[PDB]
Amino acid sequence: QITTGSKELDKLLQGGIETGSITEMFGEFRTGKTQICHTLAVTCQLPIDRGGGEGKAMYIDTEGTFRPERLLAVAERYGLSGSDVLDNVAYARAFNTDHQTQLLYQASAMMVESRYALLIVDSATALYRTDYSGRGELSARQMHLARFLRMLLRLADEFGVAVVITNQVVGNIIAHASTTRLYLRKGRGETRICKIYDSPCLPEAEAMFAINADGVGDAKD
Amino acid sequence: QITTGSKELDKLLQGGIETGSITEMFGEFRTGKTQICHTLAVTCQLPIDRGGGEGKAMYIDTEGTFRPERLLAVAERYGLSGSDVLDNVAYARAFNTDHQTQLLYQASAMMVESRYALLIVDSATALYRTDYSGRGELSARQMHLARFLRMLLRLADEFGVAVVITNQVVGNIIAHASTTRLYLRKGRGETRICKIYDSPCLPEAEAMFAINADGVGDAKD
Amino acid sequence: QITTGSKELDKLLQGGIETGSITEMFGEFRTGKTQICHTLAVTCQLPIDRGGGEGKAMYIDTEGTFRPERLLAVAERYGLSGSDVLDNVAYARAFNTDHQTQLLYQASAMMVESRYALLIVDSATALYRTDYSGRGELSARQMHLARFLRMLLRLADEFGVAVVITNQVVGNIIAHASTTRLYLRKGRGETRICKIYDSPCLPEAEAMFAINADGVGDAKD
DNA sequence: AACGAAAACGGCCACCACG
DNA sequence: CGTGGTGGCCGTTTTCGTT
């Protein structure tokens, strides 16, 4: 179980993400999906006794929001070497849906030589909206997304890593494929509300957390 | 954190601009955007213990409002050599959007040899309105602005400098790219109201400041 | 330095308009722009020791407000021959922006044979609003105005004359081109407030003056 | 049975009044 | 001065009548 670094969120998840499965967090923009991704990108490298996976991180960005400085802040919060964190995070920006899936081909071969624990795909659904904008081409983007999700599941079962994808809510296919769906909504200021909206094992429940300069971290009224 | 030279504004920002990120100040004309730019162009050279960055300044002007005498006034206010301030400020007027972006090519190579802390682009959006005035050419100016903003972010991450751009409100793309949005409005006389309209870390809040011959400086009723 | 004929205004300008440069006075209607123009049209002919330029005047009118009788009043105030004043003032009404610029072609050749000291363009911006009223044609009037301003600067540098243009405030291009911007506002009765709103050499400052039958002349409470 | 014309209804725009 | 509501005009659709 990879620690989220929010204790309340860890309790909500019973200790953190299950490696080897896809966890989807759907919420409005600015809810902190990207911030949680940046935090996990570092916490994954933490020792297992500290809630990490003792593995490198993979950040596939489609939205430009990748900040190595956020990774440095998370590393210094938990006392990890920021330089080693950036050395254990491989980053690449996907320009389109086809490029987004093509990066998985390099990811599968690269993930064999080194132990990874986390795969991050940020604005995973944005490129299927910007690229495929027509109505007759909807089935094509749905097929590409389906294949992409199957590839995610395959890599998860192959390397035993956690698969994190982010969705902006301004597909029903992900429900059966994703094991845990988390709904994120803004509480005013920088403090966010998290809700579980389906889990066969986890209750439907809510937990409050905040977005702090160091971290994605528990709410401290 | 580069001191704004207004204490109330510094408190509003928790001490001043974060270097390495873009801070956008949108407000009506005559609200003092240019005055704040002139003040920061000198305060950046202040010692870090005094709220500066101990670096040279870069002023890219598109509106003709550049005044070295204002820089001299700010330098004498804080006791900086006005001649050295003008020697540590490189100035160039952009004639068009293409020239505005082209100046960044000289800026990137020139910013490598000397330490800079502040990049100022005044009336940054005016040239996209004067040059691109048609309606079919809107996407072209939006693309050029997008590339310009990406170049700003790249230079910010490369040199760890503060990126300041000014917008006259007589684009939605800047929101995700800009980290702190400040709304400026006139209070009658020479005293201006500043409001924070988005920050993931800073509260939505307001602070009152004035525009004084020496300085951009706190309101003194 | 051509005397304004208001002593307080002369002090505000450090003695009067610099010949060879454009001085813009922007203010509300009825603030006295036209009255100041009529006064200067005569004072320019005054001896240099009296604050004149010892040159003829040029009045390009676009608004119908040209009054030779006002010129006669200014001439008799300072003791100048009203008939010779009208003989040293060449007048022409511009019917459109194209005609307004076309008159400059006759002005350049005519200004070579005789010494002039003042060029007056009254409601200089009105024809760009009445002629070019659409929104798609804004760039065309802006280009025509830009060329007109460049022609003004060229004539100023060629003949060393003062260039006076009047703007009704019910363009940002003029700022870099105009050397001294004066804001005019009404004080009730016939007494007007003048403010300097940009000058690299002149302070931002204000001076009170009145509009008297003889003259544009100092306020006398 | 098909086409054309007339009438009615709905939506959009402009003007006036009130806050 | 700005926003909201009401009224009027225009356009489109449907129905009826005539060829």
Author numbering:
A (entry chain M), B (entry chain K), C (entry chain L): 101 to 270, 289 to 339
What did the paper state?
RAD51 is the central eukaryotic recombinase required for meiotic recombination and mitotic repair of double-strand DNA breaks (DSBs). Here we report the cryo-electron microscopy structures of human RAD51–nucleosome complexes, in which RAD51 forms ring and filament conformations. We found that RAD51 forms multiple conformations in the complex with the nucleosome, such as ring forms with eight (octameric), nine (nonameric) or ten (decameric) protomers, and a filament form. Notably, we found that in all RAD51–nucleosome complexes, the NLDs of RAD51 directly bind to the DNA wrapped in the nucleosome.
DNA end binding by the RAD51 L1 and L2 loops is also observed in the nucleosome without the dsDNA–ssDNA junction (blunt end) in the presence of ATP. This suggests that the RAD51 L1 loop might bind preferentially to the ssDNA region around the DSB site, although it still possesses the ability to bind dsDNA. Therefore, the RAD51 ring might first assemble on the linker DNA as an active ring form, and then subsequently recognize the dsDNA–ssDNA junction by the L1 loop, when the ssDNA region that has been processed by enzymatic resection from a DSB end reaches the central hole of the RAD51 rings.
